[PDB]
Amino acid sequence: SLSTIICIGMAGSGKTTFMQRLNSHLRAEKTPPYVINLDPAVLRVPYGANIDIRDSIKYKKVGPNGAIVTSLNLFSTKIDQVIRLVEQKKDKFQNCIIDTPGQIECFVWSASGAIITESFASSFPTVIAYIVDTPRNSSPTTFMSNMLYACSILYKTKLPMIVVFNKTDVCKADFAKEWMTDFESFQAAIKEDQDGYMSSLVNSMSLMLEEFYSQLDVVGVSSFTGDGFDEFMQCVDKKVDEYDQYYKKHHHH
């Protein structure tokens, strides 16, 4: 009866600080999580990882990105053993929390990445937490990278996703709600009986937009203050009981 949260986001989005704050927030509710760290390159792991990749695999590399890639590969093979371990502890802990490496491509597009994700998907309800670097979200490369990576995950993983606009302590108040409002009011503008929107193309886009948006939820949080983490867990819990109905179809073993 345990559920899994997998933290993904570009370098600097604050995913390790986010996971620390999630841990601490969950500890506060007297429900500590099982923690898994899949970044080989990190110095510390906030509280302690119950399963940590690096004391399982040390390099002994034979560049700096392939060196991260390969580590994942090695890990992804003992995956069934890992799942056995977490399954044995599935009624002791309420949540399992997974940190991923900053080099995001190495996990989202890779096949050993997709295996780890699916192996978890097929054994527990699991939600993707997609951490976004909000105070620079509007920078064009960051926006494009985030749209492209996020949609790729939704597509290839076919898992529920919470978009986490992180670091709201230095961003526009009510950021997450105003983001959804502009996105939804955008979908609507798209659907109008005016010239420029009637085409089969614009109709295909509108559909594609709705299919992506409907899988995900949006929250803003500050990992520093713990502001927003209640709401985050609400979303997680929301996506969890829904998991039986919608997502279990796409994950067996």
Ligand X SMILES: CCCCCCCCCCCC(=O)O
- The residue type at 118: E
For residue 126, say whether it is annotated as part of any ligand binding site: no
Specify the length of the chain in residues.
253
Q: Per the structure block, which two tokens stand in for 114?
A: 């997709």
Tell me, residue by residue from 209 to 248, as one string, x for binding to ligand X by CB under 6 A and - for no binding: x--xx--x--------------------------------
Please identify which residue in 127, 150, 153, 240 interacts with ligand X, judged by CB under 6 A: 150
Which of these, 220, 221, 13, 222, lies nearest to 99 by C-alpha position? 13
Looking at beta carbons only, is 59 or 143 nearer to ligand X?
143
For residue 23, say whether it is annotated as part of any ligand binding site: no
* Cα 127 → chain centroid: 7
Residue 8 and residue 14: Cα distance in Å, rounded? 10
For residue 157, say whether it is annotated as part of any ligand binding site: no
The rounded radius of gyration (Å) of the Cα atoms in the chain is 19
Looking at beta carbons only, is 71 or 146 nearer to ligand X?
146
Cβ-based neighbour number of residue 123 at 10 Å: 19
Please identify which residue in 3, 4, 13, 37 interacts with ligand GCP, judged by CB under 6 A: 13
User: Is 98 near ligand X (CB under 6 A)?
Assistant: no
Tell whether omega for the bond before 60 is within 30 degrees of 0, i.e. cis.
Answer: yes
Cα–Cα separations (whole angstroms), residue 208 to 35, 151, 205, 213: 35, 10, 5, 9
Name which of ligand GCP, ligand X, Mg ion, none residue 14 binds, using a CB cut-off of 5 to 8 Å depending on partner kind: ligand GCP
Residue 107 and residue 246: Cα distance in Å, rounded? 24
What are the backbone angles phi and psi of residue 66, rounded to the nearest 5°? -65, -35
User: Is 16 near Mg ion (CB under 5 A)?
Assistant: yes
Binding span for ligand X by CB under 6 A among 35-43, 67-75, 77-85, 141-149: 141-149
Q: Report the nearest approach of ligand X to the CB of residue 213 (Å).
A: 5
Q: Report the nearest approach of ligand X to the CB of residue 132 (Å).
A: 5
Which of these, 226, 248, 176, lies nearest to 20 by C-alpha position? 226
User: Is 167 near ligand GCP (CB under 6 A)?
Assistant: yes
Could you list the residues known to form a binding site for GTP, using ranges: 12-17, 166-169
Binding site for Mg ion (CB under 5 A): 16
Could you list the residues known to form a binding site, using ranges: 12-17, 166-169
Binding site for ligand GCP (CB under 6 A): 9, 11-17, 39, 102, 166-167, 169-170, 222-224
